[PDB]
Structure formats: structure tokens, C-alpha cells
């Protein structure tokens, strides 16, 4: 699953962690097996304004 | 997003991989470092099992 999030919200994608993006529009289990890969990309997403 | 946002407000692209291990018909796995061939010497071989 690929998408884009904010900076201080990368912490909410973790097993068993509650928040505002995890509890409202994307939530992964507490018994999750796999892993996550995030690399800062604000060179292709931020516009002037 | 704008190019003046702090690192906490910057966009971040993220990919999460979710596996499955229960009853799996192994379909996606493989390094398979290919055997270099040796001839005419009594050698330990293991061809595809």
C-alpha cells in the first residue's frame, strides 16, 4: 500500500498504536507481520501555496 | 503542502508490506544464487532438490 502522509504523523503507523490517521482512515493490526518503508519525499508533493 | 513547511509538516511517501504465511502456496520467494558448473571431479551437487 503506497500513499503520502505528513511529517509528524509517520509515528502513528505502528502495531497497536492509536491516533488520527491510524484510527480514522488506515489501520494495521497489532499482530501485524511484514514491515513498513518510508523515505522523506517532499520534492514531488509540495506546491507553492 | 508548500515548500516552507517544517519537517513535521512535510509530505512523506510510505509503503507497507503485509505478508501471509498461513497455508501458503510458495509463489513469491527466490534468491536462487545460480550454481557455477564443475566437471570431472567428484563433487557435491544439489540440482533443484
Amino acid at each position, epitope marked *: 500500500d503506497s500513499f503520502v502522509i505528513r511529517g*509528524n*504523523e509517520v509515528s502513528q503507523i505502528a502495531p497497536g498504536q*492509536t*491516533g*488520527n490517521i491510524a*484510527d*480514522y482512515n488506515y489501520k494495521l493490526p497489532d499482530d501485524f507481520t511484514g514491515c513498513v518503508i518510508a523515505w522523506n519525499s517532499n520534492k514531488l508533493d509540495s506546491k507553492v501555496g | 503542502f508548500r515548500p*516552507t*513547511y*517544517g519537517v*513535521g*509538516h512535510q509530505p512523506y511517501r510510505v509503503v507497507v508490506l503485509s505478508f501471509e504465511l498461513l497455508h501458503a502456496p510458495a509463489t513469491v520467494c527466490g534468491p536462487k544464487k545460480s550454481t557455477n558448473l564443475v566437471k570431472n571431479k567428484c563433487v557435491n551437487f544439489n540440482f533443484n532438490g
Partner: antibody, heavy 118, light 109 residues
Framework: EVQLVESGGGLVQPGGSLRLSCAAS????????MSWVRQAPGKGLEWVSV???????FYADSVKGRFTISRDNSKNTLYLQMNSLRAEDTAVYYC????????????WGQGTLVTVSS | EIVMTQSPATLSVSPGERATLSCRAS??????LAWYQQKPGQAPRLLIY???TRATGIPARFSGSGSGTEFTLTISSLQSEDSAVYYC???????????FGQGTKLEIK
């Protein structure tokens, strides 16, 4: 009017416990972001604690481990249990529904004083 | 934790004129702000949120400004009852978070 009225304010000896209660009307709390704030006499305000709409709660560090927010959704009310009130916790405590980017905090509580023996 | 500094602390201006109060941040607060006028004796009241948007009901007589690290509140013509305390609240960290100012005391004559 849409409102939350509070009770429990008073005096308690140090090390003692207390529980502040917050009641609401004409509006639900379970599905509304609730946040308890407090005010030291004469000073500004500070976010103390919050309970979400899914149940995931949070508390400030100054009150972490000692205060506990809860809410009786069935009758549209909020609660905060306190213990070991020390000389610092002497403040006026407010119940609030903070919205954020969509309308800043508007509906607040009349408050309830919480001071200690000394 | 962006530290806001309001100014002045207190203010007494004749009725009907303008008053301008600035509150200064220490980091990037872009357009995340609000202004509360907590008249002494009850809960606060939101005046102007975001950058300069006036909260509902709040008399147009008020005007907010600033963005980034610097903000200002402005009143067109103070009437006698405008005397209260004012705070500029930022919200760059909504998932719990808020940071208030030092407050400003405004009175008249």
C-alpha cells in the same frame, strides 16, 4: 444551549484523591473530541488531557500517570479522576471540546477550583 | 513548543480609536492561530481563528493579521465593554496540542 457543566471542585489534603466530572447537554461527547484543560490562579491555560472519539486517550506529562479521563457516552458526560493532589495541582480545571483547524475551541466549562490543604 | 510573546501586557486607550497588539512566535506557525478574549469571570471566547478569519458573531470591529512567526490583533473602535484579556492560540500540532500566549489586558480610560 450547547454546553458542558462541571462539578467536583473543592479542597483535598495532599496525597488524597478526587474526581472531576463533566456533564453535557443537547450535544453528545462520545463522538465529540473532548479535552480537559486547567488554569493556575492568575495564569494562562494549558491542555491537560484529551479523550478521542474512538476511545484512544492522552494526557499531558505533568498529569501523566495520576489523572484519568473517562466519559459516560450513554448520558453525554465526561469525567476526570485525580489522585495525590500536591501543591502544584492547585489550579482551576476546565472541560472543553476543542475542534482545531475547523473552528477553534469555543464551548468551555464554567470551571471548578481544585486546591490542596497546603 | 513554539513560544508566543504578546504585547503589551496591559493597555488603556480612549474609547472609539484603534488599538494594535502583536504576538510573536518562535517557529513556523504559518496560518495556524486563533484569538480568544476571556472577559474576566467566565470561559474564553474565540475572536479570530486561522490567520485572520473572524469567529462567528465576533464584531467586525476586530481585525487579526500575521502569519509564519508574527501575528497581530487590531480593533477598529473600542467601546467601553471591550475591556478583557486576549490570547493568541496556535494549533500547528492538533493531535493533542495547543500553545497560548502571555495574554494582554485591555481597558479604557
Amino acid at each position: 444551549e450547547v454546553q458542558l457543566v462541571e462539578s467536583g471542585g473543592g479542597l483535598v489534603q495532599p496525597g488524597g484523591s478526587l474526581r472531576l466530572s463533566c456533564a453535557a447537554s443537547e450535544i453528545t461527547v462520545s463522538r465529540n473530541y473532548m479535552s480537559w484543560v486547567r488554569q493556575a490562579p492568575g495564569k494562562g491555560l494549558e491542555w491537560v488531557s484529551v479523550m478521542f472519539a474512538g476511545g484512544s486517550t492522552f494526557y499531558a506529562d505533568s498529569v501523566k500517570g495520576r489523572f484519568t479521563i473517562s466519559r459516560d457516552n450513554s448520558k453525554n458526560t465526561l469525567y476526570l479522576q485525580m489522585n495525590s493532589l500536591r501543591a502544584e495541582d492547585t489550579a482551576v480545571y476546565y472541560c472543553a471540546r476543542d475542534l482545531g483547524v475547523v473552528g477553534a475551541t469555543d464551548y468551555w466549562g464554567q470551571g471548578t477550583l481544585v486546591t490542596v490543604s497546603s | 513548543e513554539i513560544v508566543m510573546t504578546q504585547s503589551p501586557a496591559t493597555l488603556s486607550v480612549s474609547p472609539g480609536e484603534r488599538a494594535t497588539l502583536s504576538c510573536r512566535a518562535s517557529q513556523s506557525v504559518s496560518s495556524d492561530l486563533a484569538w480568544y478574549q476571556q472577559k474576566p469571570g467566565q470561559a474564553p471566547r474565540l475572536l479570530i481563528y486561522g490567520a485572520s478569519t473572524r469567529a462567528t458573531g465576533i464584531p467586525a470591529r476586530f481585525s487579526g493579521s500575521g502569519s509564519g512567526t508574527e501575528f497581530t490583533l487590531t480593533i477598529s473602535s473600542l467601546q467601553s465593554e471591550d475591556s478583557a484579556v486576549y490570547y493568541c492560540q496556535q494549533y500547528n500540532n492538533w493531535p493533542p496540542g495547543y500553545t497560548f500566549g502571555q495574554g494582554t489586558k485591555l481597558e479604557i480610560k
